[PDB]
Design a protein around this ligand. Structure first.
Ligand SMILES: CCc1sc2ncnc(O[C@H](Cc3ccccc3)C(=O)O)c2c1-c1ccc(O)c(Cl)c1C
Length: 153
């Protein structure tokens, strides 16, 4: 390990996807750099819930096409996310879209009773994000950049 950006990202994304899936806002110390992580999760809830509601029909359309029923379908989803997300341009708009669609897929995994796929989905989203966009995330100040961009405080 010794990759704080990856650790901080996995924690924010895992927590968001897990609470969207179940409705429960999980309690833990938020590791290192907790204030920023906390503000990032709060922001992600606001903006991510907005994306899912505003683009519900697009998201439902994509989910139907992907035909997700198991961990096998989640691995094939990560390859889709690399082509769609990584080949396209880089900004917080697309990063929130990616994470938001993750949360939408996580809600579906719970309703089809395959909630053991949620934590792997989270890891796969984090890996796509941090592995393909590392130098952009570092230049924008990571999750401090996120919080600053939405002018929250
Ligand atoms: C695997 C699906 C992914 S991962 C990802 N990561 C970042 N952006 C995405 O889409 C946006 C465009 C967008 C903004 C808001 C709602 C839906 C679309 C973009 O490419 O800029 C996507 C998409 C995606 C692409 C095309 C689509 O029709 C749908 Cl429904 C989605 C969910």
């Amino acid at each position: 390990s010794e990759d704080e950006l990856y650790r901080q990202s996995l924690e924010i994304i895992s927590r968001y996807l897990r609470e969207q899936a179940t409705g429960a806002k999980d309690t833990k110390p938020m590791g290192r750099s907790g204030a920023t992580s906390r503000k990032a999760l709060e922001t992600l809830r606001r903006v991510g819930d907005g994306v899912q509601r505003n683009h519900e029909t697009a998201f439902q359309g994509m989910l139907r096409k992907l035909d997700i029923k198991n961990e096998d379908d989640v691995k094939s989803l990560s390859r889709v996310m690399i082509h769609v997300f990584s080949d396209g341009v880089t900004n917080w708009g697309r990063i929130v879209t990616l994470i938001s669609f993750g949360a939408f897929v996580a809600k579906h995994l719970k309703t089809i009773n395959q909630e053991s796929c949620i934590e792997p989905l989270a890891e796969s989203i984090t890996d796509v994000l941090v592995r393909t966009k590392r130098d952009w995330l570092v230049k924008q100040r990571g999750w401090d950049g996120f919080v600053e961009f939405f002018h929250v405080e």
